Each structure stands twice: as structure tokens, then as C-alpha cells.
Amino acid sequence: VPKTPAGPLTLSGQGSFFVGGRDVTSETLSLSPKYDAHGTVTVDQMYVRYQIPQRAKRYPITLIHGCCLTGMTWETTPDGRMGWDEYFLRKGYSTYVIDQSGRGRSATDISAINAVKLGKAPASSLPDLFAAGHEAAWAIFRFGPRYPDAFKDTQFPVQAQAELWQQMVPDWLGSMPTPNPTVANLSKLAIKLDGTVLLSHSQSGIYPFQTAAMNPKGITAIVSVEPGECPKPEDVKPLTSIPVLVVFGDHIEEFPRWAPRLKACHAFIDALNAAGGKGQLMSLPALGVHGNSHMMMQDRNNLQVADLILDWIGRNTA
Amino acid sequence: VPKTPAGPLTLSGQGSFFVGGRDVTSETLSLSPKYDAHGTVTVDQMYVRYQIPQRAKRYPITLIHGCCLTGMTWETTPDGRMGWDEYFLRKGYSTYVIDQSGRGRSATDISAINAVKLGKAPASSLPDLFAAGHEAAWAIFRFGPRYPDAFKDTQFPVQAQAELWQQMVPDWLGSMPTPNPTVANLSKLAIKLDGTVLLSHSQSGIYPFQTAAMNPKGITAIVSVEPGECPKPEDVKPLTSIPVLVVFGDHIEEFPRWAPRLKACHAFIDALNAAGGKGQLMSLPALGVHGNSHMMMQDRNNLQVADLILDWIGRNT
């Protein structure tokens, strides 16, 4: 467990930009005369916020949030502590923190909603949208067996559950293609940067692997935190030159949502190693680190977890 | 026009948090078995990202975007130049950059959309939504007479129009009450900070004034860039102790959307001053600064404009 770094942070640079997007001509952009109903919008683009420390390490880390959340995932924790974005910067890595296509600062297309409101299209054509309620999220994140009872050993700062709920947002995943548009945008970003470590989480767990299969250029390594899906053993050949780290927390066994995902990720990692690649499945409890939730980047020992990941990145980007 | 500050930037502090929110009960959170349809969500909270320079000035600046955009408004310009967030930090001001309630990283509620999809609610229950197309935005922002023709003297980096379109997003304003939930959240933020300058734009132009009418505590000064509405002249009384700066750019008179707004804001400022307040309407062309678009924080002379505003803030704080 590292001491939290104190004092100021100096950055060589910072900024924001977007990757990708497609232009759509719509007839239903507006219900009022203040904004034209017929017009062209850009959709599917990906917001990127970058921060560059002094004398940055060769490969930036791109941080990719999962469901029901935005790039806030990686920023100050719900209880006010340093997050992984700031910690990584303090450790000398440039960071590229995205909002997935159709999430956060990355535009959606509202045309179908307005078409239904205007009586031009049926309710069945509304987009497939969802939001994770507090009670559902408690169990998905493995804070305890069922809301509102927490595991006594959880690392998540459950006293700050209200703040976690504040950062959760509706999810448009189901209304976009698969692979999600973020996947192609991550390839464009990796190529632009000429080498980045892709770090994903949960719903976006599979994204970096899909990006690498589409085009391996610029993908230095992949870190996936509790992915919803790992690649199939049959997907390893295109990945054998990209080191992979998959990280799982605690209280996995008692949740049917999660136990099979850990097992499947082992099948992937083992297949990857057998094919001549380099994969590791880091199960925190096996390292003597207990109680981590699905939101391990926000947990009370989040910097201990970050150090394990950064140590691995340093050994596999060498 | 100032030289663009060079070299690294040092942060004493940085972070993110949310203000506000309300918990609601839904029965339409999901149409799938992966997520429960019945549950509680938090909506109307406001995302806030802050950066604190060393030896920060006493009063932070809170930057509040307008329609069809997010806090990206204030970040790197579309053509890659320093934005006002970074420039203000380099000038010694702590900055708080928000996403309005129901925009960007600030959650919307999808329950009504899903209720309509499930047949539980009529289609009129759908939220009132809009997005500004490229063609519409060109005119709203006053880049030229019609898309994609630019005024010869525009300060906007029109070569980066595709990048500007990338930062534009759907707007849920019309589906929230008025005053928008952002207004009460700005009051909470101002009180938390114990004094901030509120700087708003266009759709949010009126917000700081609505905030101050709700509760003046913590509102040190107000800067409104090309507001869509200014307070009525009859409503100036509650604002007479808060210095106010309203800024307008160029090519106003040829756009019927904008000519009346400049006029109405003069009526407000004059009424405010007549009532004992302190208001200024800064028209850039009257200062010899020509060609600014509605997106003046992203224009090629954006640091010249920033310096005019910061000089005013310094004199009124």
C-alpha cells in the first residue's frame, strides 16, 4: 500500500479533442422553430481528455470506462480521494481519458426519439436505452449480497454511495452497432499516438481486444479490469504480440454474473500463453489483497491496485 | 492580443465532483433481463471538474456552457489552441468547469422514453429534445451568411468546422423545468466555494441571474457571454450588489436571432445601473475588436477576449 502522493502536479500539457464520427442527415432534429428540424449532425465521435506529465513515459495509458458511467470513473473517487487518472500522471504516464461513443460528452443521435414524438415513427423504433438503478448496481458491483447490505470487508467506500450514484448515467450501448463505435475510434487514437496501453473496464473490457483484431497498430499492451467478456480461445492468434493483463477482485464466487466471467477469462489467458502470447490473470485475493469490488479503481486500496497494474505495465512495455 | 503563455502548468489541486441530484423511482429502467426495470436512479446532478493553480486568486471562476455543447466549450479550441479553462488557470484563477444538468457527464433520465416504448405512456411523454445541425449552427454562431460561407473577417477558425461539429451534442433543456436544475446547483456550488465568479454563455446566459435571485450567497460577480435572455428591467433589484459584465461580439445586426438580444441586454444593464447596481455591456466592435463569433472563447483572438474579461473581473472583485 503506497502513501498517497502529496503536493502539486506539473503538466507539460493538457487538452481535449474528438476522434471519429460520421455525418447523418436527419429530418427530425427539432420540434421547434428555434432549431432546424432538417440538418446534418455528427454522431459516434469519441471525446478524449489528455494530460501529459513532464518527461512522460513512452507509452500513454488510455482509460476506457464501462457501462452506466463516463470517464469520471477514473477521476476523483466518490469519497474524494485521488483516482487512477491523477495517480497515473503522478507516476509519469500520459493519460487519455475517453467518454465512449454515445456516452457523456460524446454525442448521441436523438432523431428517432423526435420522430416518435412527431407521430412519424412508432414507439417500437425508440432507441434501446437502460440505466442501472442503485439497487441493481449494488449487486452488479459486488458491494454486498443485496441492497443495502454491504460486505463487512468491502474495499468500496460505501459511505459515499450517494456520490457514486451521482456519476452514473443512462447507457445507449444497445442502440449502437456491435462492435461499439468506440472500438474503431480506439484504433484511430492508438494510431495517432503511435503506441498506447489500452485499459478498459466491464462493458468495455472486450473493446481493446476487438480494436486489436481490427488493426493491431499502435496497441502496446492491454489491461482489462473485470471484463464482461474476454476474447474466445479461438481469438488469440492476432493477439500474441500484445501483452495482456486481466484483473479481478473479490467476492466473485457468490455472484452468478461474475463467476463464469473469471473462468472464461482464464480460458482466454491460458490459450494466449499456449499460442506464444503473454497473458496474466491477476486475481487480487491470490496476492493477499482482499475485498475489492468491481469498482476497484475507486476502492479504498485503489492505489495498491494501481501499483500492481503499473508494475506489470512497466515490465511489459520494457 | 497577448502572447500565448508557454511552458508547463502546475496544479496545486485538481478533481471532479457532482452537485445536487434527486432520487426517483422508476419502473422502466430497462427493457432487458440484464438490468432491473424497477429501481432508483439519481438525476439532475451537475458534473464539476476543477483545477486550482498555485497561489490561486481569492475567487474561482465557474464556467457554464450553453446549448448543444458541454464543458468541452472551454477546453482546447476546435483547431487545437489553448482554451479559457487553461488560460484562466495560467492567469492564477481556480476554475470550475461544469456540464449542465442533463448534459454531458450529468445524468439524464431515460424512464419516460422507455415508458413510451413499453406502451405505458403516450408519445407526448417523450422528452423535448433538439440537436443543432451544422447548417443551423453556422447561422446561430454567426460564422457567415449561410453555411458553409464564412464572413471574410470572422475570428472563428472555420477551417476546423468539422472538429467543432464533433463537440456538439443533443440538448435536453426543454424536458427539464425552468429555471433549469443547473441554476439551483450553481447556488449550491457558489455557497460551497464561498464566493465564485459565474461565467455563462447563450442558453445559460440567464442562469447566473436566476441563481442570484434564488440566493445571492457566494455569487461574487457575473459574466454572461452573448446571453439568449437577460433579466427583465423590472427584476434588477435583487442584483444591485453583484457586478455584472455582458459581452457581445460582431456581426450582430444582420442576424434577427441576435439583434434583439443585444438590445434587450442593454435595457437590463441600464436598468441595473439606474437602480444602483454595476453593469457593463461590452460590445467588442466598440473596443476596436472585430469579427468575433458567438463562440468567442474559441475564436482566433480568444485570449484577447479573455484578457478583457479578466481585467474586468480583477477590477470588480
Side-chain angles (χ1 to χ4, degrees), chain A residues 1-2 4-318, chain B residues 1-2 4-31 33-151 153-317:
Chain A
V1 182
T4 305
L9 174 59
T10 298
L11 298 182
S12 171
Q14 75 178 197
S16 303
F17 58 91
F18 285 80
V19 175
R22 66 185 177 95
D23 283 2
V24 170
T25 302
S26 176
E27 308 313 317
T28 57
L29 295 177
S30 181
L31 322 166
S32 104
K34 281 193 67 174
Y35 303 93
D36 298 346
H38 168 86
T40 309
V41 292
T42 304
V43 300
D44 293 343
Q45 62 270 31
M46 176 178 78
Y47 173 73
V48 186
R49 176 68 165 173
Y50 69 89
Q51 289 191 112
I52 303 188
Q54 299 194 295
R55 305 194 300 278
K57 289 174 178 287
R58 172 61 185 86
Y59 302 109
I61 302 170
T62 297
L63 299 172
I64 310 155
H65 67 79
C67 92
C68 322
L69 295 162
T70 70
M72 174 67 188
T73 291
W74 315 103
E75 297 182 350
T76 311
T77 68
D79 64 319
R81 291 179 289 105
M82 189 180 295
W84 285 5
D85 182 18
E86 180 177 353
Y87 190 64
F88 289 1
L89 293 169
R90 289 179 178 274
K91 292 287 195 164
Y93 288 91
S94 295
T95 63
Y96 289 73
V97 178
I98 72 136
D99 286 343
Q100 282 189 42
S101 296
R103 195 82 55 73
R105 295 177 170 189
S106 302
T108 57
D109 185 2
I110 52 63
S111 295
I113 299 163
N114 280 178
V116 178
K117 196 165 171 65
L118 287 164
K120 297 185 180 190
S124 51
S125 70
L126 287 167
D128 179 28
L129 308 178
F130 67 97
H134 303 167
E135 308 87 346
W138 190 270
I140 294 165
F141 297 163
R142 308 194 311 284
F143 294 163
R146 63 195 69 74
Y147 180 84
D149 286 328
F151 295 122
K152 303 304 181 84
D153 67 1
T154 183
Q155 293 278 358
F156 189 82
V158 292
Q159 76 281 8
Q161 62 171 288
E163 290 80 8
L164 175 62
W165 309 146
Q166 286 174 312
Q167 72 172 79
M168 295 191 70
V169 300
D171 198 321
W172 289 58
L173 188 83
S175 80
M176 266 168 297
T178 300
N180 186 88
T182 303
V183 169
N185 289 328
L186 290 167
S187 171
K188 290 178 169 181
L189 179 60
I191 292 166
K192 170 184 178 59
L193 297 181
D194 194 33
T196 183
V197 174
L198 300 178
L199 190 156
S200 64
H201 186 215
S202 206
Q203 172 189 82
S204 66
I206 196 61
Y207 295 181
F209 303 104
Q210 293 174 338
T211 300
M214 179 193 298
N215 188 344
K217 184 170 184 41
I219 305 178
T220 307
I222 299 168
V223 178
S224 186
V225 179
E226 296 198 353
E229 292 305 329
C230 276
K232 300 299 192 67
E234 297 72 24
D235 291 336
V236 299
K237 321 93 82 264
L239 305 176
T240 53
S241 284
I242 298 166
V244 174
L245 178 67
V246 173
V247 187
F248 278 83
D250 208 356
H251 294 278
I252 293 287
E253 277 102 61
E254 61 200 283
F255 292 87
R257 192 185 194 93
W258 287 110
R261 292 177 168 175
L262 174 55
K263 193 166 161 183
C265 285
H266 278 295
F268 164 60
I269 291 294
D270 292 346
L272 181 63
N273 289 324
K278 295 169 56 204
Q280 175 177 334
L281 199 150
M282 176 182 289
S283 171
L284 294 170
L287 299 178
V289 178
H290 302 97
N292 282 100
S293 74
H294 181 60
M295 299 300 299
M296 67 180 70
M297 70 296 292
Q298 297 177 358
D299 279 351
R300 290 183 298 100
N301 69 334
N302 69 332
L303 306 189
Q304 180 182 214
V305 178
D307 280 353
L308 287 164
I309 292 171
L310 296 175
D311 172 77
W312 180 92
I313 292 173
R315 290 183 275 127
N316 287 277
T317 55
Chain B
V1 185
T4 301
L9 179 59
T10 299
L11 302 163
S12 176
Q14 126 178 101
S16 304
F17 60 91
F18 286 80
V19 176
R22 61 193 185 89
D23 280 13
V24 295
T25 292
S26 177
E27 61 192 22
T28 57
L29 296 177
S30 176
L31 307 231
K34 293 167 177 172
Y35 305 92
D36 296 344
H38 294 88
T40 310
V41 293
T42 306
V43 301
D44 292 352
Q45 60 272 30
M46 179 179 76
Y47 175 72
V48 185
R49 183 144 75 186
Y50 69 91
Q51 294 193 124
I52 309 302
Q54 297 189 123
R55 294 96 61 173
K57 288 176 180 303
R58 173 63 186 80
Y59 304 108
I61 302 172
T62 297
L63 299 173
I64 310 155
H65 68 261
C67 92
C68 323
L69 294 165
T70 69
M72 173 67 188
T73 292
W74 314 104
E75 299 179 352
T76 309
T77 68
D79 63 318
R81 291 178 292 105
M82 191 180 293
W84 287 5
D85 78 323
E86 179 179 348
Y87 189 65
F88 290 6
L89 294 167
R90 289 179 178 273
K91 292 290 165 189
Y93 289 90
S94 292
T95 65
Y96 289 74
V97 178
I98 73 138
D99 283 347
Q100 282 188 222
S101 296
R103 195 82 53 75
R105 294 177 171 190
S106 301
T108 58
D109 188 2
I110 54 57
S111 293
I113 293 162
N114 284 175
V116 175
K117 201 170 183 180
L118 287 164
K120 294 177 179 287
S124 68
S125 287
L126 292 170
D128 276 357
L129 305 180
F130 62 97
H134 304 164
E135 309 88 345
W138 193 269
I140 293 159
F141 297 161
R142 307 193 313 284
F143 293 163
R146 57 197 61 79
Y147 173 87
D149 298 334
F151 289 123
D153 70 358
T154 187
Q155 294 280 357
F156 188 85
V158 291
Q159 29 97 183
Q161 61 192 256
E163 289 80 12
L164 174 63
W165 310 145
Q166 288 170 312
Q167 73 174 80
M168 297 193 67
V169 298
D171 195 323
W172 289 55
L173 187 83
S175 78
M176 269 167 293
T178 300
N180 182 272
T182 301
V183 171
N185 289 329
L186 290 167
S187 174
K188 289 174 167 183
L189 179 61
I191 291 165
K192 173 187 176 63
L193 298 181
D194 193 31
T196 183
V197 176
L198 302 177
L199 192 156
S200 68
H201 187 214
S202 210
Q203 171 190 78
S204 64
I206 194 62
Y207 293 4
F209 304 108
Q210 294 170 328
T211 71
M214 180 179 307
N215 188 344
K217 184 172 189 71
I219 307 182
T220 310
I222 297 169
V223 176
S224 189
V225 177
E226 294 199 354
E229 299 171 278
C230 281
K232 294 176 148 57
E234 319 89 82
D235 291 334
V236 297
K237 334 75 93 285
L239 305 171
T240 55
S241 290
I242 299 166
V244 173
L245 178 67
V246 173
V247 187
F248 277 84
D250 207 356
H251 294 278
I252 291 289
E253 287 291 347
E254 58 199 292
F255 288 87
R257 192 191 193 88
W258 285 110
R261 289 176 171 180
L262 172 56
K263 273 185 71 166
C265 287
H266 276 295
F268 159 60
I269 292 292
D270 292 346
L272 180 64
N273 288 325
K278 60 156 132 163
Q280 176 181 337
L281 199 156
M282 177 183 291
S283 171
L284 296 172
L287 297 177
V289 178
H290 302 101
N292 285 99
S293 77
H294 180 61
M295 300 299 299
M296 67 180 69
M297 72 294 293
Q298 295 178 358
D299 280 349
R300 291 181 182 186
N301 67 336
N302 71 333
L303 308 186
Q304 178 182 217
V305 177
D307 280 355
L308 286 164
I309 292 170
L310 294 178
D311 203 26
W312 180 94
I313 291 171
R315 294 189 298 272
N316 288 277
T317 52

